[PDB]
């Protein structure tokens, strides 16, 4: 009777900024990937490790739904072994990643005339992110030899930048919503399964 809350993540009125990517843990329910597997809304649906066919007959002790927004021409950075500002300083997938990356254009949802500057990404970080690491720090990034003391200026930069989604933008610069389904399983009893 209990179905898993994939609508809460996919149909959410908001997504998080990629640097503050949101994660919902999915435990102790029956998840059918039927709705998602065959759906006319998505423009990316790549699965690693698992095949998307078998999705509704294989299982895991938990699944994580990671929600965020980026622009389309960076959606291919949401993949194992890839590089770029999103993969390096916002959201990193592991090399052994078993799960599905789903993405769809959301220009009538997250762009607005004059621009929506609520969706940010981190463009400055001292080191690359580890897989599934999240950095919310907003401390001024020191690019020079002299410290910043929380003041921006030359060689002292705010580490985040807004996307500025406008509906007139080209499709590569349009906002795309992305759900990363991480299938985790250990030898605890499997708690999230499918219609079988």
């Amino acid at each position: 009777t209990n179905l898993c809350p994939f609508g809460e993540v996919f149909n959410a009125t908001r997504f998080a900024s990629v640097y503050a990517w949101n994660r919902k843990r999915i435990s102790n329910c029956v998840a059918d990937y039927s709705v998602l597997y065959n759906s006319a809304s998505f423009s990316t649906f790549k699965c690693y490790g698992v095949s998307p066919t078998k999705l509704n007959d294989l299982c895991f002790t938990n699944v994580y739904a990671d929600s965020f927004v980026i622009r389309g021409d960076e959606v291919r950075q949401i993949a194992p072994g890839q590089t770029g500002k999103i993969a390096d300083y916002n959201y990193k997938l592991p090399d052994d990643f078993t799960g599905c990356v789903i993405a769809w254009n959301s220009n009538n949802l997250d762009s607005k005339v004059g621009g929506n500057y609520n969706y940010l990404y981190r463009l400055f970080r001292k080191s690359n992110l580890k897989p599934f690491e999240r950095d919310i720090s907003t401390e001024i990034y020191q690019a020079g030899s002299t410290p910043c003391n929380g003041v921006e200026g030359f060689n002292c930069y705010f580490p985040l930048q807004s996307y500025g989604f406008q509906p007139t933008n080209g499709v590569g610069y349009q906002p795309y919503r992305v759900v990363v389904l991480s299938f985790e399983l250990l030898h605890a009893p499997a708690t999230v399964c499918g219609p079988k």
Partner: antibody
Amino acid sequence: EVQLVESGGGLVQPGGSLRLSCAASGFTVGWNYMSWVRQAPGKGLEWVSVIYPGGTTFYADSVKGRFTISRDNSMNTLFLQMNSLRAEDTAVYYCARVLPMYGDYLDYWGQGTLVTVSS
Amino acid sequence: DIVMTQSPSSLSASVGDRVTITCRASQNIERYLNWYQQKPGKAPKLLIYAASSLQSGVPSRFSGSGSGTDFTLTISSLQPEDFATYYCQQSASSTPEYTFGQGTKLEIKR
């Protein structure tokens, strides 16, 4: 004050190697986006390579598999190691600090070092 | 890869004149376009970033405008030290694949 000083350029035989250095003062190269840009004699600017603060590298398709960009933080220096140099690689090579806040733009350039490859 | 075509390729103008250089992109690059100035034997100097924003320390007579495919760099009063070659450069892609125009050489008439 900030400056970038290039060195290591000179004559290299076709197919040979050479390591260009760019010493920085002001910004620390380890924490910056850095790039190498080349300019063939009398012609225009061509992007060569870029290194991210986190270590990620990117190369133009002319130079992939032959050029590698690297850093020394102690020395505060950027390096461009070039192997199997071709005649077309003859150019002035500039190092430049790159800022990512409005796309990527190069706000301070090195002042070039000339690499001539011929037999 | 995106192609930047500058117009004209060479230009001559008098001290005090208004000068306009155009940069056209093969694809839409929004405002990810920068303008650099290179004097002979010297390092290129950044003049304009984000299509219309002026780099600090650059005289106010330099200014840039445009968006999408077409952009213009204008100098409102030309002066003798502005003889140079001017390059536009696009930064549209999320991953680095920058390209430059082929430069406009600006010579002084006297």
